[PDB]
Amino acid sequence: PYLGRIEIMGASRRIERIYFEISETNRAQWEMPQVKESKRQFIFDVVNEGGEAEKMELFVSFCEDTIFEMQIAAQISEPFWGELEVQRVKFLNYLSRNFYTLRFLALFLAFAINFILLFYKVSDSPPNMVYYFLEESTGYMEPALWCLSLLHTLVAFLCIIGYNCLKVPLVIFKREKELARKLEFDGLYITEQPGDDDVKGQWDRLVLNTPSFPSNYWDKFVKRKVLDKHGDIFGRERIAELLGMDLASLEDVKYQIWKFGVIFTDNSFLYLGWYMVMSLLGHYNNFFFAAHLLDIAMGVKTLRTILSSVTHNGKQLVMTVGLLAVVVYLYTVVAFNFFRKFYNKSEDEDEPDMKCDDMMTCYLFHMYVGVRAGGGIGDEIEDPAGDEYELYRVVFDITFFFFVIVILLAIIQGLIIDAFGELRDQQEQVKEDMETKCFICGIGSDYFDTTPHGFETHTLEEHNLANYMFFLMYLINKDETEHTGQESYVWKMYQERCWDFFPAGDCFRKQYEDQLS
Amino acid sequence: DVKYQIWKFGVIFTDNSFLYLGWYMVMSLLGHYNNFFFAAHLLDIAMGVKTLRTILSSVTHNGKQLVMTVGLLAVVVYLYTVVAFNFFRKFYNKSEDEDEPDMKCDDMMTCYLFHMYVGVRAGGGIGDEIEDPAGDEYELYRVVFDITFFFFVIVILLAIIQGLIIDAFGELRDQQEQVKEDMETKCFICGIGSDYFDTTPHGFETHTLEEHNLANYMFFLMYLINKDETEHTGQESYVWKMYQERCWDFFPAGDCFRKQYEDQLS
Ligand SMILES: [Zn+2]
Ligand SMILES: [Zn+2]
């Protein structure tokens, strides 16, 4: 239960098995459903849109993110300026622990507000100017709407605060983590400099000189390592002034501005801010509470997966909608040049309403009524029977119907129908790969299945990606002086970002098969 | 045993097929009250005909997602209703009479019902039903309203609804094909690939007919159950003990007689 077990490619160039102790708190945090869903999403992403070369780097990044999330969860968990500080941190922890409940409550409140909004009525007379007011016999909905609007605004504000307390630390952690990696192993601001059209790199400069650069990232030796790696070649004084460190120490408005910039560029934070703004506009005009019904797309995973079918081929949907416009424009040109006499949409004899005596009017008429008509433009425009251009006109109508109504809408619907099957195939392929190959070492399940339940044992004990994350957390928490020999070996390999200690293509059984059996 | 009979009757009354047959009998009884209650027994074809059951399985495979997209259509039509009720109230007069107007969007509930009723069922959307906007101040906003309604609701949402069914057909077909491929390329009892047995001609056929026959395993289990404990032989007693302790380790997994004695046999 607490006894951990991983296999590494040891210094002796052989597979070695490492035993360590796992904390019950870490095990419970791992078993939490949020972490389970995060792991599933990561596995899907790497199997689907990932390369075999970078699989271990991606896996280590996932492990680091999961470790930081567990640390934040442990921080927010629960068992005269001091009094207000204690109360404030308690309130913030409560908001962080109930962020998702607050989001669900906000969705419910929006639904209730809109259901009450379904009873609004418009009258010229008071209960030019028109008076909008509720019309219900019960009388409870009129105060209920005001109470629910106040509650919805409060819940939206609490959701913003909870997000800032919970999911912003991870964004800042990843940002600082990536900046440190690029600074050390790429010399981004020492050797190359950013692209300059890269908004992120330019903003990141503001934080290099700050004393609190590794505020969330664990490694506090980021600057010292970069100095040792680069200063000897590129100027010790220049590196020190760039990184804002003092060279005689061997015996933050800018940081806050940079942090706020990252927060304001965060997509989920922007979405929650827009949600709060619309909730505020709701008190101005209650029908602005109808823009919070769009939150179901982010709320319900089933609806999100359904809409993913539409958005999988969204670029091609836009392309085919823009192609429909060009085809209808060509039909408009032909109509305006040759069949102007059929586009009289006025029943009155004396005054004619000619829809194709102007190019813009004809194009609007086509794109409006011809596309939405069941049989095309022939349904709307005048019948050509007994006319000189009857055959040209019937060819016009038939080709419009076939190319636009039939073929183009068939393409639009086939894109969605194909997107459904493509997403299904992606899920099936990920499942098949995860059930027929080992993630860490990439050895087929047939080899392990010679022993009954061999692949199950290999994926549960020998090569467990949960155990690897537990070992990484163990190394990070353990002291450098306290590290044992193999732990120091793996720690050095991790510090140099060398993923060669992961057994790739080899395992304990494959190495000692002759002796074991 | 009154308690045992009560428990048995509770299980019977919770049985789904028993409840279905009880409902069938109740509707048959109501038929004598009103003969048109015999039309509720035409729904029995779904349970009766396996072909129709498999056809309806296409609809029911993604039934949760069908309900979800029907509930999403309601929200989208509600947003269009809000926009209409706020801005285009003047186009929703469905009365040919000049003096008395029938305004379908002077009330939020009436407008929502009008949209969900006629706009969804119309071929071109709500623009077909409501008044033409030509020569009006809000003509462009109104044509954008109509075009987006047609594309999002009539085209995209119904395309999603039909794509769910079309995908369900292919998914069921793929399930059947995968089961057939697994059953024809791997052995059920021991999980050894057919390629190994196919070195001998008809080797996999012989393995699945004589060596590892899941019919033979059921026959042996019935034989053990019927046979007396005292009459059991040695290996039969071994398997009987393993069965009593619910230990399925006597099933050969990954090994077979041929694989074990290949050197001696050939
Ligand atoms: Zn492995
Ligand atoms: Zn077998």
Swiss-Prot record, chain B:
Q: Which positions in this protein are listed as binding ATP?
A: 183-188, 208-214
Localization, per the record, is: Sarcoplasmic reticulum membrane
| Residue ranges that the UniProt entry lists as topological domain Lumenal | 32, 86-108, 129-148
Segments carrying motif Selectivity filter: 123-129
Other comments? Binding of [3H]ryanodine indicates that the heterozygous channel is activated by Ca(2+) concentrations 4-fold lower than normal. Single-cell analysis of cotransfected cells shows a significantly increased resting cytoplasmic Ca(2+) level and a significantly reduced luminal Ca(2+) level.
**Quaternary structure (record):** Homotetramer. Can also form heterotetramers with RYR2. Identified in a complex composed of RYR1, PDE4D, PKA, FKBP1A and protein phosphatase 1 (PP1). Repeated very high-level exercise decreases interaction with PDE4D and protein phosphatase 1 (PP1). Interacts with CALM; CALM with bound calcium inhibits the RYR1 channel activity. Interacts with S100A1. Interacts with FKBP1A; this stabilizes the closed conformation of the channel. Interacts with CACNA1S; interaction with CACNA1S is important for activation of the RYR1 channel. Interacts with CACNB1.
- Entry comment describing in which tissues the protein is expressed: Detected in skeletal muscle (at protein level). Fast- or slow-twitch skeletal muscle.
Q: Which residues of the full protein are shown?
A: 4772 to 5037 of 5037
According to the UniProt record, list the residues that bear Phosphotyrosine.
Answer: 92
Modified residues annotated as Phosphoserine in this record: 95
Which species expresses this protein natively? Oryctolagus cuniculus
**Can you tell me where the transmembrane regions are?**
9-31, 33-49, 65-85, 149-169
UniProt lists the family membership as follows: Belongs to the ryanodine receptor (TC 1.A.3.1) family. RYR1 subfamily.
* Protein's name according to its UniProt entry: Ryanodine receptor 1
Which residues point to the Cytoplasmic side? Answer: 50-64, 170-266
Q: What does the UniProt record tell us about how this protein is modified after translation?
A: The N-terminus is blocked. Channel activity is modulated by phosphorylation.
User: What task does this protein carry out?
Assistant: Cytosolic calcium-activated calcium channel that mediates the release of Ca(2+) from the sarcoplasmic reticulum into the cytosol and thereby plays a key role in triggering muscle contraction following depolarization of T-tubules. Repeated very high-level exercise increases the open probability of the channel and leads to Ca(2+) leaking into the cytoplasm. Can also mediate the release of Ca(2+) from intracellular stores in neurons, and may thereby promote prolonged Ca(2+) signaling in the brain. Required for normal embryonic development of muscle fibers and skeletal muscle.
Residues where Ca(2+) binds: 230
